[PDB]
Design a protein around this ligand. Structure first.
Ligand SMILES: N[C@@H](Cn1oc(=O)[nH]c1=O)C(=O)O
Ligand SMILES: N[C@@H](Cn1oc(=O)[nH]c1=O)C(=O)O
Lengths: 259, 261
């Protein structure tokens, strides 16, 4: 049986190849997770079909309906057999789906328009001139909503009531907002996307401060899936062979169009 | 029928260390450290009583080629001598094949420790010279890394280390640190970044971590394959990290009382 892989269009993990309109199937995409999927499948011995998550979200649980959306939802409801994307390993998710050991490390970080008067999260919380938000339906937003740390708590109180909305539908939108806000908007996103955007034209953004936390991305499968074991061992072998580092260098620093 | 959980761990600073008056203390009270605190937090969150026991052979864990017998903490789990391992045990493929690991509670990578002033800033530097000797810890993931690497530079380093005389391998991290400190810069030690940065903050502040890490991995809490404690332990680790506890514990044992400024 062909394995259904749910993923999300997020640079440089999964992107549409140039001329993708005349391409079909898996050949339409390119990126770190596209290469990763190939390696995993190769090591686990299964054929697969890449599909972009329907609602374009990562995965959150609606406090009301208590339904899961994004990639997490597709795994939970049997729409997909596995998730191969920059999906953050978290407690709430781990309670409904399984995660392989992490294939990449990261932490929430700050992205600013070059020249912006901000060096840390604490800075952002002390001022009101510069707005700041996060992605929706993701682990970053949850981070602030559940944080009991003074600074983060303060930032959350501000963000959930900010007007206009400081939350964005996609990372691209958060980035575009920073670039077009003349420094009046700072975006909170994972260090991985941050450092990637940092090395791309027009090279007008940069990462400031340390990471707010430390965690990783994991390949996810429906709770109690037979693929779980082989996938986990595959991630470990790939990391030990140095493949994960090669892929990281290939989609991140190689083609460094910035200075 | 709830029973006291046997925790195998290892005397490795600052994860597990003997308290000052350890001889006036008994049981778990004899020890202090990052993993001692971690054990308490996990036990609390999972609701179990435990007994900390230092691994007999003082090794992390390796499979003897030929007899296929595992030693160290990994062996304690495999042969049922312990119920769980709470220590800086590196999550690796060969180990995950015989025991279970929770998600990472700490991140690290192999690194280089030098005596200050030593003319080395990378693994490549080490591989192109013979004046400065270098080695790793025995029965661990670092030695296995070089032994199994297909990467040119690392293969070259392993080829040199495995046959150097006298032996460049040490039985304990402490022995490796001593060798770096007393060898006038003629010895460089390969060890995990975590131990490296801890030592860098200890007197007499004569060692330094140089270059980036050779890899990126983590430490996990290990349990015998199929253990019932597995699930709860994994979740506990995740909750602790999200609460910021783990970041707090590392600063406590690494920097809060650093001895080098
Ligand atoms: N990897 C995140 C998605 N997301 O990307 C960011 O940069 N922030 C954020 O929430 C997830 O798995 O929910
Ligand atoms: N955590 C390592 C033990 N060890 O510590 C080092 O610094 N190198 C090394 O092999 C393991 O689990 O085998």
């Amino acid at each position: 049986k062909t394995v259904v892989v749910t993923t999300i269009l997020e640079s440089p993990y999964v992107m549409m190849k140039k001329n993708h309109e005349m391409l079909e199937g898996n050949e339409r995409y390119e990126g770190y997770c596209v290469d990763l999927a190939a390696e995993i499948a190769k090591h686990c011995g299964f054929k697969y079909k890449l599909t972009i998550v329907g609602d374009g979200k990562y995965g959150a649980r609606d406090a009301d309906t208590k339904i899961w959306n994004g990639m997490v939802g597709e795994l939970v409801y049997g729409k997909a057999d596995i998730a191969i994307a920059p999906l953050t390993i978290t407690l709430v998710r781990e309670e409904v789906i399984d995660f392989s050991k992490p294939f990449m490390s990261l932490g929430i970080s700050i992205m600013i328009k070059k020249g912006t008067p901000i060096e840390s999260a604490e800075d952002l919380s002390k001022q009101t001139e510069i707005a700041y938000g996060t992605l929706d339906s993701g682990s970053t937003k949850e981070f602030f909503r559940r944080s009991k740390i003074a600074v983060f708590d303060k930032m959350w109180t501000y963000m959930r009531s900010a007007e206009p909305s400081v939350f964005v539908r996609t990372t691209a939108e958060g980035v575009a907002r920073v670039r077009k806000s003349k420094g009046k908007y700072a975006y909170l996103l994972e260090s991985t996307m941050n450092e990637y955007i940092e090395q791309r034209k027009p090279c007008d953004t940069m990462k400031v401060g340390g990471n707010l936390d430390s965690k990783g991305y994991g390949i996810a499968t429906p709770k109690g899936s037979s693929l779980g074991n082989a996938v986990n061992l595959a991630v470990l072998k790939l990391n030990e062979q140095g493949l994960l580092d090669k892929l990281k260098n290939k989609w991140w620093y190689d083609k460094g169009e910035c200075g």
